[model samples]
Target: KQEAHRALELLEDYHARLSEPQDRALRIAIERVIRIFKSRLFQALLDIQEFYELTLLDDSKSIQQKTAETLQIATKWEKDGQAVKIADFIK
Candidate 1:
């Protein structure tokens, strides 16, 4: 649960940073999101090739479709007793 919340908070903060006009802040926010996603989520999923084979084989589904499916799965995990608390200092 904590991790999810932390990820959410990070996303929110990233978005906040992204709203600024400065390119450096926006880049930082994007990089942070990507780093978090890679370390906390994507790495745990199967390799990219395997993920493609398992979930992206449907020709009718675009990459965005698979992304939505993946988000749904993450939401399910958060609802199903996973601790996704945001760290106290992150807000």
Candidate 2:
């Protein structure tokens, strides 16, 4: 019990120190890294589900129509350039 209490005490201090550095010089870059990760996660996971449902599962409609609209939405960040690099590198 005493050892566990000591661990929590150290954890509290560690948390405060971690926040200190994150608020300083490296903050914005680190924050943007997390932002990009989440954006990619949303596009990959959510859009994949829709693609499977609209294009794969339902074959009645033209795939060209479904795919065209999906690509427009999924590739919304292409002009800014990260989207292309992100997928190609991973691919």
Candidate 3:
């Protein structure tokens, strides 16, 4: 829960920084960090649903709509836990 709130703040901060011109190196670095963070967070699913909900608070209206649509899709796939039983497989 704490992390989810932090994630929203990070996203808001990133978008704020992105709106203004910055040094190329700084912008690139920020973009790289954002990509890496998103990759790990989405894969981890630690607070994905909450994160998605918070995305609606983004300054971009288009993004808010997009997030809502994506949330629906995610819920569809996540309705049932995606867990594998060890007895059903072997390495």
Clashes of 3: 0
Residue 31 of model 3: what lDDT?
76
Q: Candidate 2 residues 1-91, lDDT tens each? A: 4586475465444444656654665555555665676688788897779877867678786878777877776577455565334544642
How do the residues 55-91 of candidate 1 rate in per-residue lDDT, one tens digit apiece?
7787778789888977876687668676666667553
- List residue ranges in candidate 3 displaced over 4 A: 1-4, 11-15, 18-22, 46-91
Model 1 residue pairs with clashes: 1-82, 1-83, 1-84, 1-85, 2-83, 2-84, 2-85, 4-84, 5-84
- Flag regions of model 2 displaced more than 4 Å: 1-17, 21-23, 59-91
Winning model by lDDT: 1
Q: Assess every candidate by TM-score.
A: 0.28, 0.39, 0.34
TM-score of 1: 0.28
Scored by TM-score, the top model is 2
Residue-pair clashes per prediction, in order, are 9, 0, 0
Summarize candidate 3's per-residue lDDT along 1-90 as a digit string, tens digits: 458758857764765576546555776777787788778778768456655665554556586577676778678668647755466576
